[PDB]
């Protein structure tokens, strides 16, 4: 017949050592993706929480404070949580600065 | 009236 | 300043030390109290190895929490945890700067580590569900305890109408007393109110539906149409709906002097549960036939049919929050709480309740349901339709529980049972106005 005369695909001589076929299972190994799957080790819903925390570590203090309990509604109305509430429409530039102000600024009733 | 007995 | 990989430096922490470090309703509160004490103890007692380790930011508490074998911001994302040998750590110290003398100063008043102080000062979550014994019980001697009965009913005016024996009594929450309306020869089975508490539609044991006034304490009129006892009542702002043991499904248009408007006899056996849909012109019906029918308006044609029941079922009604969601109770041998969807023919849930179900109550601002029970365990079952998991179980009734209802605020719930007890629990809690506020 004719088996080794065709060279139109990956064959036994294209890989350097012909005996590597003995293992031939390392190709079908999914490598753990970089960040979130580090939490499954600790646990041995939680993995996604650790992904959120990992990517959430890249914040400034005030920026994170702004986004601590931030919730965005579908229609564009945004509610901001103070640790009062700052319910207002997003896409106007003033509301975010006002949340910043009441977050880091000083307010005193003074009797 | 509360004070329900067992 | 950076250690080599092939020749790592050894930390002071020993093999078995990591074995120690990695070791781990009022019961939940005590368990949380014990865990923070243990975490604080192992954090403070250890940490000299952890203090010598690390490169920047982070904390010894984070390192301990990362050891595998309202939240504030985590500093850094390193999850190295405990380790025998360290590569990065080569002894090095930052020069003293004004922040450091600020830091060593707030430390001078602290008898413990700053990290432990931050952990303790951090607020634990105050997230608990309180479903305990009733905080208030009143008097109602000689309460009816028949399976086809539904007596108590909420009204917006803090007013409860109860059929105690053969007389109708009125309980006012604002006053806490009992007021007698009237009495008759035949016992009452179903109670209802029309309008805004102006009228009280009551069903008797012979189907002789007589409307009694509340303020005037008089019988408004006397109707017929049922040759057997009424089982439950419902209404949507203009027409009362009555179901009875003799398969009668009577809709009464209270506008004209003869309220009787239409009748429906589409079931195979007796009708026991019948709650009209106030929002939409639909009706939910069922009984001991193991068959639940959904009608459109007053027409006799069953738009939807579902027959998953197996015994005498009394509890079926629409859920106010999500439209088309009908919850149906179980039976003596069925005991299946079944949640259904109208206009889509979809089974949302079907779960054993552990006992026969007789009545249901839906919350106001949450997806919490309470269901009555009888002839099997004489208890009450709490329900969460979103996650399908019971929360708490309420018991303590000499006779079976049949009558239930919701308060105005969604907090108080009432139970009706032959034990002559009313158990009250507490489970829950634009530029037009710009022009108004210009004048002050």
Nearest CA-CA partner of C134 in C397, C428, C427, C423: C423
Angle between helices C98-108 and C114-121 (to 10 degrees): 70
C415-431 in b/e form (b: 16+ CB < 10 A) is bbbbbbbbbbbbbbeee
Q: Pairing relation of β-strands C292-296 and C167-172? A: unpaired
CB C384 within 8 A of CB C369: yes
In angstroms, rounded to a whole number, what is the distance separating the alpha carbons of residues C5 and C88? 9
- CA dihedral (C100, C102, C108, C110) positive or negative: negative
Q: Do C and A touch (≥3 CB pairs < 8 Å)?
A: yes
- Both tokens of C53, joined, read 């380790």
Let me know: does C376 contact C149? Beta carbons within 8 Å.
Answer: no
Cβ–Cβ < 8 Å for C169, C162: yes
CA C355 to chain centre: 18
> Measured on CA atoms in the order A94, A98, A99, A100, is the torsion positive or negative?
positive
Residues in Cβ contact with C158 at an 8 Å cutoff, skipping those fewer than 6 apart: C172, C173, C174, C408
- Residue C46, token pair as written in the block: 């250890």
Nearest to C427 by CA among C383, C389, C385, C387: C383
Q: How far apart are CA C197 and CA C215, in angstroms?
A: 9
Q: Which residue of C has its CA nearest to B6?
A: C396
A90 Rama sector, left if φ>0, alpha if ψ -120 to 50, beta otherwise:
beta
Provide φ and ψ at A29, rounded to 5°. Answer: -130, 120
Interface mutation target, options C132, C135, C137, chain B, most CBs of B under 10 Å? C137
Q: How far apart are CA C201 and CA C213, in angstroms?
A: 8
Mutate to test the interface with C, among A57, A61, A65 (most CBs of C within 10 A): A57
End-to-end CA distance of chain C: 72
Residues from chain C contacting residue A41 (CB–CB below 8 Å): 68
Q: How many alpha carbons lie under 13 Å from residue C187 in its C-beta half-sphere?
A: 14
SS3 C160: strand
Residues near A22 by beta carbon (within 8 Å), at least 6 away in sequence:
none
Q: Give the Cα separation of C205 and C128 in Å (integer).
A: 44
Q: Does the beta-carbon distance from C396 to B4 stay under 8 Å?
A: yes
Enumerate the residues of chain A whose CB falls inside 8 A of the CB of residue C77: 35, 53-54, 57
3-state helix, strand, coil in chain B (%, to 5): 0, 0, 100
- Polymer length in residues for chain B: 6
Contact C421 B4 (CB under 8 A): yes
For residue C344, how far is the Cα from the chain centroid? 25
Q: How far is Cα of residue A100 from the mean position of the Cα atoms in its chain?
A: 25
Does C57 contact chain A (CB < 8 Å)? no
**Are the C-beta atoms of residues C205 and C226 closer than 8 Å to each other?**
no
d(CA C440, CA C437): 7
- H-run or E-run covering C231: strand C230-235
CA angle C28, C32, C34 (to 5 degrees): 115
- Resolution as reported, in Å: 3.5
| Beta carbons within 8 Å of C43's beta carbon, 6+ residues apart | C60, C61, C64, C113, C115, C116, C119
3-class state of residue C326 by DSSP: strand
- Nearest-10 Cα torsion for C393, C396, C401, C403: -80
Structure token pair of residue C7: 């020749």
Q: Which two tokens stand for residue C405?
A: 């209802």
CA dist C96 and C94 (Å) reads 6
- Which positions in chain C touch A38 (Cβ < 8 Å)? 79
Q: Is C137 on the interface with B (CB under 8 A)?
A: yes
Task: State the Cα–Cα distance between residues C383 and C359, nearest whole angstrom.
Answer: 13
Which residues precede a break in chain A, with C-to-N distance above 2.5 Å?
44, 83
Reduce the DSSP state of residue C283 to 3 states and report it: strand
Question: CB A38 to CB C79 under 8 A?
Answer: yes
Query: Strands C380-384, C393-394: parallel, antiparallel or unpaired by DSSP?
Result: antiparallel
Please list the residues that pair with C318 across neighbouring strands: C326
| C358 Cβ contact partners less than 8 Å away, ≥ 6 residues apart | C147, C314, C315, C329, C371, C372, C373, C374, C400, C401, C402
In eight-state DSSP terms, residue A104 is H
Helix residue ranges per DSSP H, A67-108: 93-104
In 3D space, the residue among C153, C118, C128, C151 whose CA is nearest the CA of residue C40 turns out to be C118
Report the neighbours of A using a cutoff of 3 or more CB pairs below 8 angstroms.
C
How many Cβ atoms sit within 10 Å of the Cβ of residue C68?
13
Question: Scanning every residue of chain C, which has its alpha carbon at the shortest distance from the alpha carbon of A64?
Answer: C73
Q: What is the CA radius of gyration of chain A?
A: 28
Determine whether the interchain pair A57/C74 forms a contact, defined as Cβ–Cβ distance below 8 Å. Answer: yes
**Which stretch of DSSP H or E encloses residue C57?**
none
């Amino acid at each position: 017949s004719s088996s080794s005369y065709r060279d139109s695909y990956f064959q036994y001589r294209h890989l350097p050592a012909p005996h590597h076929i003995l293992y031939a299972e390392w190709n079908q190994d999914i490598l753990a993706l970089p960040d979130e799957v580090a939490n499954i080790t600790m646990a041995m819903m939680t993995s996604e929480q650790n992904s959120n925390r990992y990517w959430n570590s890249f914040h400034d203090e005030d920026d994170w404070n702004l986004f601590n309990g931030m919730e965005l509604e579908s229609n564009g109305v945004v509610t901001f949580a103070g640790q009062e509430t700052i319910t207002g429409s997003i896409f106007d530039r003033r509301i975010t600065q006002l949340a910043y102000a009441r977050n880091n600024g000083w307010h005193e009733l003074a009797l | 009236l509360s004070d329900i007995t067992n | 300043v950076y250690g080599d990989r092939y020749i790592p430096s050894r930390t002071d922490i020993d093999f078995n030390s990591i074995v120690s470090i990695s070791s781990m309703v009022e019961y939940q509160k005590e368990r949380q109290a014990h865990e923070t004490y243990n975490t604080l103890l192992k954090n403070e007692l250890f940490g000299e190895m952890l203090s010598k380790d690390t490169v920047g930011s982070e904390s010894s508490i984070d390192r301990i929490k990362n050891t595998r074998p309202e939240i504030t911001r985590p500093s850094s994302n390193s999850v190295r945890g405990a380790s025998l040998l360290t590569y990065q750590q080569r002894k090095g110290r930052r020069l003293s700067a004004a922040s450091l003398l600020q830091s060593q100063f707030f430390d001078s008043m602290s008898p413990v580590r700053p990290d432990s102080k931050q952990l303790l000062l951090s607020p634990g979550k105050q997230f608990r569900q309180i479903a305990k014994v009733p905080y208030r019980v009143l008097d109602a001697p000689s309460l009816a305890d028949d399976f086809y009965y539904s007596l108590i009913d909420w009204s917006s005016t803090d007013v409860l109408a109860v059929a105690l024996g053969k007389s109708i009594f009125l309980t006012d929450n604002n006053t806490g007393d009992v007021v007698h309306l009237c009495d008759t020869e035949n016992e009452y089975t179903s109670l209802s109110w029309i309008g805004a508490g102006s009228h009280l539609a009551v069903g008797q044991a012979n189907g002789l539906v007589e409307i009694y006034d509340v303020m005037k304490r008089k019988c408004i009129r006397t109707l017929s149409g049922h040759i057997d006892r009424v089982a439950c009542l419902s209404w949507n702002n203009h027409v009362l709906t009555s179901g009875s043991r003799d398969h009668r499904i009577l809709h009464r248009d209270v506008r004209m002097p003869d309220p009787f408007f239409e009748t429906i006899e589409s079931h195979t056996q007796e009708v026991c549960g019948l709650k009209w849909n106030v929002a939409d012109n639909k009706l939910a019906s069922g009984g001991n036939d193991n068959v639940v029918h959904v009608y459109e308006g007053t027409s006799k044609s069953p738009i939807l049919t579902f027959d998953e029941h197996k015994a005498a079922v009394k509890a079926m009604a629409w859920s106010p929050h999500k439209r088309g969601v009908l919850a149906t109770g179980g039976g003596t041998a069925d005991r299946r709480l079944k949640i259904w969807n109208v206009n889509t023919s979809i089974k949302m849930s079907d779960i054993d309740s552990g006992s026969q179900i007789c009545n249901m109550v839906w919350s106001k601002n949450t997806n919490e349901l309470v269901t009555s029970h009888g002839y099997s365990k004489y208890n009450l079952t709490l329900w969460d339709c979103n996650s399908m998991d019971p929360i708490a179980i309420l018991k303590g009734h000499s006779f079976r529980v049949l009558h239930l209802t919701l308060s105005n605020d969604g907090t108080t719930v009432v139970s009706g049972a032959g034990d002559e007890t009313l158990r009250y629990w507490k489970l829950f809690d634009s530029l037009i106005f710009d022009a108004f506020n210009q004048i002050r």
